[PDB]
Structures are given as C-alpha cells and as structure tokens.
Design a protein that fits this description.
This is part of a larger assembly, with chains A (about 130 residues), B (about 160 residues), C (about 35 residues), D (about 80 residues) and E (about 120 residues). With about 35 residues, chain C is mainly alpha-helical. Helix content of chain C is about 50%, strand content about 10%. Chain C starts with a helix and ends with a strand. In chain D, strand 2 and strand 3 form a beta hairpin. In chain D, about 20% of the residues are buried. Chain D starts with 8 loop residues before the first strand and ends in a 10-residue tail after the last helix. The chains are: A alpha+beta (about 130), B mainly alpha (about 160), C mainly alpha (about 35), D alpha+beta (about 80), E mainly alpha (about 120). Chains A and C meet through strand 4 of A and helix 2 and strand 1 of C. Chain E: GO terms for molecular function: protein domain specific binding; RNA binding; structural constituent of ribosome.
Chain lengths: ~130, ~160, ~35, ~80, ~120
C-alpha cells in the first residue's frame, strides 16, 4: 500500500486487573520433531521472539531417540529434541509468548511446556496448631 | 401490534390503519415498533398530498407522546425514509427531524445521514455531515447503514470534489 | 461389561501388515523411515 | 486437545524453609520416606490421583499441611523409640 | 453560514421473532467476506471451531465442579455397609482403588458403591 492505508487501527483490549500476577521461576519448552532443520528454524524463531520480548532464554539439544521395528523389512522412527529454558518471566509474559510460539508451531512438531510456578507457604502451615 | 406490523410489512396499509383505530377504541396502547409501522403505512397511503401526510405523521407523534411511548432511531429513520419520497418539499421537515433526534439524546447512525443525503441529492450539506462524522467509529444500529458510503460517494461523483 | 468387572472384583497404528507396508513405503505414514 | 499427563502436579519445598524442630523434622522425614532427598533437603510431593490439575494441586497442598501437622504431633506411642 | 445542527426543531419530545429477526438483520450490515488469514483464524476462534491458545489440555472439562475430597475421600458412602466385618474390609479395598482413579467421575464411583450395596443387600 503506497497511499491507501488504514487511518487508525483498533488495538485489542488488554486490561490491567487487580489480582496479583503468577510468577514462573523457569519455563522449559521441549519441542520434538522428525526433522532437525525444522527444529533449527523453530529455535531461531523462538529465540528471536524471546529476545524481542525481553525474556531470558537458553537453548540446548537433548539426545535423539530412535525407535526401530520389524514386520527382513526394517522400519525406523527418529525423534529429535530442542529444549528452550526461559527464566524469570511473569504470568502474562509467559502466556503471550507461549500463545505466539504455539500458534506458530510447525506441522509435525509437538511441544511439552513445563512451568515451575513460585508460591508462598499457605497461611495454615506457618505455625503449629495449639 | 403484531397484526399491525404484519399488515404493514405485506402492504396492508389501510387495514393496518383500521386495526390501529380499533386498538385506540379498545383503550389499548401501541409500541414504538407499531408506531413505526403506522408511520410507514400513513405515508404509503394513496391519494394524499404532502401537507396532509405530514400532518398525519405529526398527529401520530402526538399520539406517541400521549401514550407515553418514547421513540427510537428506527422511528425517525422511517420518517426520513418516507420523506425521501417527497423530494424538495421534504428537505426542511427532514432537517427538523434530524434536529429533533440530536436534541432528544438519540445519536444518529449512518442510515440517517444516508437518508438525508439521498433526499437532498436529486448538496453542500454533505460537507457539514462530513465535518460532523470525521474521526468517528460506528456500530451496527440500522439495516441501511451499509448504504451510506455508496450514497456519500455518489455525491463526491456528482459535485466533482476530490477533497470530500 | 461393568457388571462383569464388579463380579470379578467380588471373587500401534491398527492397520494390517500389508496395508501398513504400502503406506509406509509410499511415505504416507509420517515419521516412518527405512533403516 | 485432551492429554492424560497434564493432570500431574509436582510440589517441591525445602524442609529447612519449614518451621520444624528436631523431633518434627525427624518425624516428617520418616513419614515421607523417599520423597525426601537428603542431598538437596527437598521434599517432592507428586499428585496425580484426581482427574483435573487444580484438584491435584489442592491435594498436594493438603498433603503438605497434614504432613506438617502430624510431624508436629507426638502420639503417646512415640515414647518407645 | 451556520451548521445544520442549529435551527428550528420539532420541540415535540424532550429526552419475540420480530426482535430476533431484527437482530439478525443488524448482523448483516457489517457482514463482509474475510480479508486475510488472521481474520479467518479470529472467526474460527469465535465460532469455537479453532482451539484456544495457549493450549490447555483440560479445556471445556470441569468434572462437574468436583473437588479433590469428593474423589480422594469416598468412605462416607460406606456408612450403610457393615462397620467391622470382612465386608468392611472388601469395601475399604474397593474405595481405596476408586479414590486412586483419575479416569472416573465422582458419580461413576458412587454408582459403583451403590451397585455393591445392592448386590450385598440381596445376598
């Protein structure tokens, strides 16, 4: 568009609630695929998005798994892994980042998100019952 | 009210008027949608001049005041859709109706300005309408709102004004 | 069914080897390679 | 979208962060057993009994509460250690 | 040289299936075809055809608003059984099994218990 542009855009309604936000110490995202190149592309996308949102991210590669079987005729299934560990992100940041990267998850790739929420002791355990 | 609305919807204007007289005779009231139906019927009634029909519309509005029914956007939009049939003589009645809507707290929709634009296009009023509407976001309130921009652009075609 | 379980208490792809082979050879089963 | 493995919840708390005396700590360790790792001083309670995840989280919190309370309690019977 | 909003006024006022059809007719006035892919995803999300992200594996399932104590403590349903015989032992085993069952609802567990009640009442 060189001239015809939207004069204004309706930004979505994001309300600042009164409740306190959830806190995640860690957030491990393990993605599995049959293709190493797709996992490398997804790692690049996820890491760039994490940088652009200010989240602290580290990436490592868990060992691959190979399930072989027979009907001779020998068949194989490869599973390659990429682990993205995010650190010190609140509840809203985690939700928005996860929505983005899960909607952009490529076909043939599965995800397992482990969230480690930080919580205080319950009030009812602080001191013994008398 | 259901019978009257059905009658007017299928072009039974005279029968609708008769049933409304019966409604009055029974000491019952009518709803706002019923009165919109009646306004449409009174205008669509054949063999009457502009002044007589406008007087009937005013009588119906005075009845609405009498029965304690408050109008909505559809009533005045119906009045303007009707006034569109009467060309030059209807322009100042239409402006009066627009002033009434803005006075009684009912915000005009796109369908209202559509009706005004077409009743006037048969034209410097479009400039005033645009000066009003600049920067506003609209929401669906009348079925004829989707006819506005079309009509509006027609004026910019006929008036040969690019800035408008 | 449930009654039978109660009285007892009181006491991978689901295709044929052939049809699997055809799809696996044509590359229609995602992830299945040859060794 | 259902997955049976999403109901699991794991609570991890350091016993040094709980208000336990010598006897209370000894009782809690003996009660929990292998859930307590001596090297890390961490008690790890994993709940998956209930169908949902909020229910398993509530159950883990309840288990921790009752374990603490029964660690702070001395039965008559305790005297024969 | 004045706007059309200042001048003489009427002065006359101051301050079912019909409704459903009028509402659907108001729906049409902004009924445009999709403009791009994001709009299509938005429409499918609103219609409920598309999943809601971030993925929640327990979406649309609440288990009748049950709480954990209704799953884990099922021993209040053994009140009408014998309190100290071997039947108490067997039903304690049954309820210990049922309280460890994540695949059943509370209603199905209590139905199992009630079947046991009926069977042992007959025998």
């Amino acid at each position: 568009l060189h001239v015809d542009v939207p004069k204004d855009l309706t930004k979505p309604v994001v309300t600042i609630s009164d409740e306190p936000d959830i806190l995640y110490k860690r957030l491990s995202v393990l993605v599995k695929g049959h293709d190493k190149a797709v996992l490398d592309s997804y790692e690049y996308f996820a890491v760039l998005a994490a940088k652009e949102l200010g989240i602290s991210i580290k990436v490592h590669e868990p060992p691959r798994k190979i399930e072989r079987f027979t009907l001779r005729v020998q068949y194989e299934m490869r599973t390659l892994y990429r682990c993205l560990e995010l650190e010190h992100l609140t509840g809203s940041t985690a939700d928005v980042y996860l929505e983005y990267i899960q909607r952009n998850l490529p076909e043939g790739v599965a995800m397992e998100v482990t969230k480690t929420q930080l919580e205080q002791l319950p009030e009812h355990i602080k001191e013994p019952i008398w | 009210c259901t019978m009257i609305r059905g009658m007017v919807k299928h072009r039974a204007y005279e029968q609708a008027l008769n049933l409304y007289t019966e409604l009055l005779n029974n000491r019952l009231h009518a709803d706002v949608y019923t009165f919109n139906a009646l306004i449409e019927a009174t205008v669509c009634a054949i063999n009457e001049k502009f002044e007589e029909k406008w007087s009937k519309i005013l009588e119906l509005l005075r009845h609405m005041v009498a029965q304690k029914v408050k109008p909505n956007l559809q009533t005045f939009n119906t009045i303007l859709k009707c006034l569109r049939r009467f060309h030059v003589f209807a322009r100042s009645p239409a402006l009066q109706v627009l002033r009434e809507m803005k006075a009684i707290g009912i915000e005009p929709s796109l369908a209202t300005y559509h009706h005004i634009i077409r009743l006037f296009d048969q034209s410097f009023i479009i400039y005033d309408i645009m000066n009003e509407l600049m920067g506003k976001r609209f929401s669906p309130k009348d079925p004829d709102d989707d006819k506005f921009f079309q009509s509006a652009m027609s004026i910019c075609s006929s008036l040969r004004d690019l800035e408008l | 069914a449930d009654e039978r379980l109660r009285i007892n208490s009181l006491r991978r792809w689901r295709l044929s080897r052939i049809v699997f082979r055809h799809l696996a050879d044509h590359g229609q089963l995602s992830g299945i390679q040859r060794a | 979208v259902r997955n049976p493995r999403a109901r699991v919840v794991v609570l991890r708390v350091k016993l040094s962060s709980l208000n336990l005396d010598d006897h209370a700590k000894k009782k809690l360790i003996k009660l929990v057993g292998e859930r307590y790792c001596k090297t890390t001083d961490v008690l790890t309670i994993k709940t998956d009994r209930c169908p949902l995840r909020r229910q398993n989280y509530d159950y883990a919190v309840y288990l921790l509460t009752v374990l603490y309370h029964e660690s702070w309690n001395t039965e008559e019977w305790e005297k024969s250690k | 040289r004045k706007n059309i909003f200042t001048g003489k006024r009427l002065n006359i006022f101051d301050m079912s299936l019909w409704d459903v059809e009028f509402a659907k007719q108001l729906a049409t006035v902004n009924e445009q075809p999709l403009q791009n892919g994001f709009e299509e995803l938005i429409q499918w999300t609103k219609e409920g055809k598309l999943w809601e992200f971030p993925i929640n594996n327990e979406a649309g399932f609440d288990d009748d608003g049950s709480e954990f104590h209704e799953h884990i403590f099922l021993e209040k349903h053994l009140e009408s059984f014998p309190k100290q015989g071997p039947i108490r032992h067997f039903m304690e085993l049954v309820t210990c099994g049922l309280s460890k069952n994540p695949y059943l609802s509370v209603k199905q567990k209590v139905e199992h218990i009630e079947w046991f009640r009926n069977y042992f009442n007959e025998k």
